[PDB]
Amino acid sequence: WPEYIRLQRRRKILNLRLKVPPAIAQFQKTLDKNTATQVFKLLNKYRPETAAEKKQRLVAEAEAVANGKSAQDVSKKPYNVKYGLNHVVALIEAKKAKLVLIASDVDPIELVVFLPALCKKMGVPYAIVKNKARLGTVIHQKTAAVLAVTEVREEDKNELASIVSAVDANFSAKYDESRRKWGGGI
Amino acid sequence: YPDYDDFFTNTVRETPLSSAPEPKRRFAPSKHEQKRILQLAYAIRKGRILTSEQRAERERESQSNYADHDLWAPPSHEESYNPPEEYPKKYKSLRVVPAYSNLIKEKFERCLDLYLAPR
Amino acid sequence: GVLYVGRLPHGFYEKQMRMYFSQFGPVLRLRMSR
Amino acid sequence: NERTRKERVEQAIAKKEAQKKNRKETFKRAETFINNYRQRERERIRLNRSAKNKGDIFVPDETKLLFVIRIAGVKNMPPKIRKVLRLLRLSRINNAVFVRNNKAVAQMLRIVEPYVMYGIPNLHSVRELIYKRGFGKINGQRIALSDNALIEEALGKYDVISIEDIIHEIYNVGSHFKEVTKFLWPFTLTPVKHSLMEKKVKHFNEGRKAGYCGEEINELIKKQV
Amino acid sequence: ARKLSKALGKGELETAKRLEARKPTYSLDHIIKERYPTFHDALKDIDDALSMLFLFSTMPVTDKIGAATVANCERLCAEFQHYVIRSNSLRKAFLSIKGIYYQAEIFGEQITWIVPYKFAQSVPTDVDFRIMHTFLEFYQALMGFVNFKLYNTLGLRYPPKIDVAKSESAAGLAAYELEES
RNA sequence: ACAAUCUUCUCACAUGAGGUGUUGAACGAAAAUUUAAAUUUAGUUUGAAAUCGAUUGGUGAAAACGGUUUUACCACUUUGU
RNA sequence: AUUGGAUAUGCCAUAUAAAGCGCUUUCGAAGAGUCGAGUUGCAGCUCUAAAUGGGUGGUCAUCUAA
RNA sequence: UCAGUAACGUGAAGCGGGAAAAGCUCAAAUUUGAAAUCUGGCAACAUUUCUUUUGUUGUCCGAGUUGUAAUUUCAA
């Protein structure tokens, strides 16, 4: 074996053989396969505009202004998913977010360990999904840590009230005692 | 190893937390874009940015590259439809002549011989 | 055993369920009430 | 080293059929069937709507023949749809055959328009289509018409000896056009995946369309072969 | 392709479209410079390239073969047919069993090219089309470079103007109008 | 592919004629019909909510051997051109 | 000949912007194995904080470290 | 200078008098009506203590939402 692989299987197992505190225990019990395929289907409309094609619409916005036309008077308030850890902590404290999504593999685990406790207190329905990179693909990033819907348009409000009800009923309604007991030690 | 003492986060807080009022810059066009538009708009008047139609039509005169500049500043064996020298096969009519399917394998073998067979 | 699954998407038939439940095992009886 | 090249090719033949036989019995997710019961309900509604109080057709005129191709299919289709597919000779998708335009044909052209795309055939395109994909059902076997001797042997009763004479009886569709198509097995216009994106897209076929393509049908034929 | 699959594998369709137009393509200029020094020597080795240009120009579209390059195979052979007809370079012609073998002579070098009949061909399933698409690309440059030379030698346009309406009507060399440049 | 074809008018003439299409469940009125049964059938209600309560007339399309089983909106223009 | 900050003047600028100070029925985030105590030669070892708190000086004054 | 003074042979410091005086920058509050940020590759335009220097603009990756800019540093 190489010099590093025999570490790469051992830190896999020392997360199992030790006593995981109940704060960290919930970060391995995770939203399932099925209900984690509709959340990202709703989000794949509300992606942030790719930075290359936000400029593309900006040169198409700045060419008519150079002639006399405009669209700022008729520009409706935009929509997208809201990301970034520091922007989503303030979206929960202000009770603006409605669905917080926590990655299950943030490397320093303290970055997100207060979020399932903050979402329980502020009444923001939450779920812990796999693969921080899977969130990163949503927002044109390498690794995202968290996302949040704060406002979908009137088109998907009826869809969102249904998909949250799948999030509480599978993550929050279940997983209710494994978050209240220690983990690991297998 | 006790259970999880959620003595505080047991309930739900109903209010928001930060009390400073909502700023006015969340209810109007993004003034950072409006500054960004004016940088692009100015750039058109100085003619450094080709515009959106110019984004399209200057791609279309390209991708036509077929030798636009000058770089230089065995035979048949008398075989035909009615060959009487020997009696391949003799074909009475050109319309009755079939298609010799071995030419694809023969020409590829000759092409592969110049690159793989030695000389 | 018997089951009474509710909140199905409208139009779902026993032909749809028996095609799916047979992947879980034997499907003796099925009744889509109307 | 042709012996080792053939043996490795023989080793390549065995691995291709093994994975084709091993990849079997894929489980059906609960999403597929409920949509199938809906897409079939959509086709049932599309059939009765186009039949009841809709007994009129568009029939793009100025063409004695038309080009109709089933660009796709319906999983567990209706019994009337499949029999019509058996009637229209497009039993398999991506099959190529030109049919004479008629009022009865337009009824069939409006019957499977949800599952097939119609249009008009070009003059020189059909001249190359027969030259490229002319594969008649020779003794029931879809053999290519590589020589006019066999064309004169089978279509001698129809007074057709050459492909040009067959095309002249097809473009200017005569009485032998129906018999020539009866003896000819339909062609297969499988869409060609050229670029690197064509092999990656999820169940895409270079973006075919549905309806009366018209000149675009000739453009589709232009990319067909 | 390991940037496109990164784009296609992350669902971003637009960067998957923006990079295939700027798909990096090498140029075939300096690789025909050194291997064929003289145009007469290039005329001497123009038989197999033009024959291959006349070979794949009549078959159906293959996966490894280029559909757009088929039009290049149609345009290059027609230009070779139009320029030779304009210069009356063809001297000997035989209608053999394989087809019509045309023996011409342009710029001093006598060249023989074999052309087959337009028959209902089928895939041989044994010729490496991957190796054929590469070899045809090596023959696509010489067909155009000679057309860049022959049309300049004859005063015509390189490439000549092609009438699409006559091409859609299958006029052959009449479509590619050999207008004097 | 949990993507998909439900009608953002038509036709005539300028006046017409058309435009077939809607969860479930609970609730409950008083009248008319139609042929005792059915039909129309106020007002309700509610999370695309549900825990036995199925009614049973007619039309035929394929396998099968004239019976037989299979359709999960086959409806009276009545299940495969 | 290289170079300084200026003075006047020419052309550009992009300003849909930025800044000073009133006025507030509103808010006002502040640095830890550090502070601190015990203890060996400001370092070592053991232990380990708080928010009108914490530090240094006479209940007050004065400061705002890591 | 306080001063060989307080304090304990060692030995300051405050005040006062001079010289010189210039202040400030981050972390911690959401840009969320839009990562507005930056390195790099290529190409044009300059420019020089300088053909040797130093930049601007266009363009393509890349860094960056585990936080790059604007804003603020308690005097507020």
Q: Is D166 exposed, middle or buried (0-12, 13-18, 19+ CB in 10 A)?
A: buried
As a whole number of angstroms, the distance between CA E11 and CA B55 comes to 24
| Residue A174: C-alpha distances to residues A29, A112, A170, B7, E147 (Å) | 10, 20, 6, 20, 75
Of A39, A52, A69, which is closest to residue A148 (Cα–Cα)?
Answer: A39
As a whole number of angstroms, the distance between CA D163 and CA D161 comes to 7
Strand pairing of A99-103 and A126-129? parallel
Q: Is the bond preceding E159 in cis, omega lying within 30 degrees of 0?
A: yes
Record the tokens describing residue D19, joined without a space: 């994975």
- Compute the nearest-CA separation of E47 from chain B (Å): 12
E abuts B (3+ Cβ pairs < 8 Å): yes
- The owner of tokens 């009507």 is E169
For residue C4, give the 3-state DSSP assignment: coil
Question: Taking the C-alpha atoms of E68, E71, E76 and E80 in order, what is their torsion angle to the nearest 10 degrees?
Answer: 170
Angle between the N-to-C axes of helices B103-115 and E129-154, in degrees from 0 to 180, rounded to the nearest 10: 90
Enumerate the H helices of chain D as residue ranges. Answer: 2-22, 30-51, 79-87, 103-109, 123-133, 148-154, 163-171, 176-183, 215-224
Nearest to D124 among E4, E62, E170 (CB): E170
| Residue E168: C-alpha distances to residues D126, D222, E134, E174 (Å) | 11, 10, 28, 12
Pair D100, D59: CB distance under 8 Å:
no
Bridge partner residues of E112 (DSSP) = E103
E180 Cβ neighbours under 8 A, 6+ residues apart: E154, E155, E156, E157
Pair A153, A79: CB distance under 8 Å:
yes
B68 Cβ neighbours under 8 A, 6+ residues apart: E148, E158
Residues within 8 A of A (CB atoms), E 76-95 only: none
As a whole number of angstroms, the distance between CA D102 and CA D99 comes to 9
As a whole number of angstroms, the distance between CA A37 and CA B90 comes to 69
Pair D71, D168: CB distance under 8 Å:
no
Of E155, E54, E133, E59, which is closest to residue E100 (Cα–Cα)?
Answer: E54
Of C22, D86, D174, E42, which is closest to residue B70 (Cα–Cα)?
Answer: E42
| Residue A158: C-alpha distances to residues A82, B40, D162 (Å) | 20, 40, 66
- The owner of tokens 């739900």 is B12
**What residues of A are in contact with residue B15 (Cβ under 8 Å)?**
95
Of E67, E39, E73, E54, which is closest to residue E145 (Cα–Cα)?
Answer: E39
Amino acid code (one letter) for B106? E
E156 Cβ neighbours under 8 A, 6+ residues apart: E83, E86, E150, E178, E179, E180, E181
As a whole number of angstroms, the distance between CA D207 and CA D191 comes to 9
As a whole number of angstroms, the distance between CA B4 and CA D189 comes to 66
DSSP per position, A38-92 = THHHHHTTSPPPPHHHHHHHHHHHHHHHTTT---GGG-------EE-HHHHHHHH
Record the tokens describing residue A158, joined without a space: 């009826």
- Compute the nearest-CA separation of D34 from chain C (Å): 6
- In the 8-state DSSP scheme, what is residue A169? I
Which of B66, B95, B110 to probe by mutation at the E interface, max E CB count within 10 Å? B66
Resolution in A: 3.7
As a whole number of angstroms, the distance between CA B61 and CA A157 comes to 47
Of D186, D70, D194, which is closest to residue D133 (Cα–Cα)?
Answer: D186
Nearest to B103 among E95, E98, E132 (CB): E98
DSSP per position, B56-68 = HHTTTS-S--S--
Which helix (H) or strand (E) segment holds residue E109: the answer is strand E109-116
Chain E's closest residue to D224, CA to CA, is E61
For residue E91, give the 3-state DSSP assignment: strand
Strand pairing of D187-188 and D95-100? antiparallel
Bridge partner residues of D66 (DSSP) = D99
Bridge partner residues of B56 (DSSP) = none
Interatomic separation, CA of residue A87 and C1' of nucleotide G24, rounded (Å): 29
**What residues of A are in contact with residue E11 (Cβ under 8 Å)?**
44, 137
DSSP per position, E16-69 = HHHTTTT-----SSHHHHHHS-SHHHHHHTTHHHHHHHHHTTSS---SSS-HHH
Bridge partner residues of D98 (DSSP) = D67
E1 Cβ neighbours under 8 A, 6+ residues apart: D196
For residue D31, give the 3-state DSSP assignment: helix
Chain A's closest residue to B2, CA to CA, is A181
What's the CA angle centered on E171, arms E169 and E176, to 5 degrees?
115
Q: B57 and chain E: CB distance < 8 Å anywhere?
A: no
Ramachandran angles phi, psi of B29, nearest 5°:
-50, 140
Technique employed here was: cryo-EM
As a whole number of angstroms, the distance between CA E58 and CA E94 comes to 20
E139 Cβ neighbours under 8 A, 6+ residues apart: E48, E49, E50, E52, E53
Residues within 8 A of C (CB atoms), D 1-60 only: 27-28, 30, 33-34, 36-38, 41
For residue D30, give the 3-state DSSP assignment: helix
As a whole number of angstroms, the distance between CA E152 and CA E148 comes to 6
For residue B114, give the 3-state DSSP assignment: helix
Of A72, E153, A100, D73, which is closest to residue B31 (Cα–Cα)?
Answer: A72
Question: Taking the C-alpha atoms of E5, E7, E12 and E15 in order, what is their torsion angle to the nearest 10 degrees?
Answer: -120
Pair A117, A93: CB distance under 8 Å:
no
As a whole number of angstroms, the distance between CA D73 and CA D205 comes to 13
CB contact under 8 A, A182 and B1: yes
Of B47, B51, B41, which is closest to residue A66 (Cα–Cα)?
Answer: B41
Q: Is B19 exposed, middle or buried (0-12, 13-18, 19+ CB in 10 A)?
A: exposed
Which nucleotides of chain G does any protein CB come within 7 A of? Answer: 13-18, 26-28
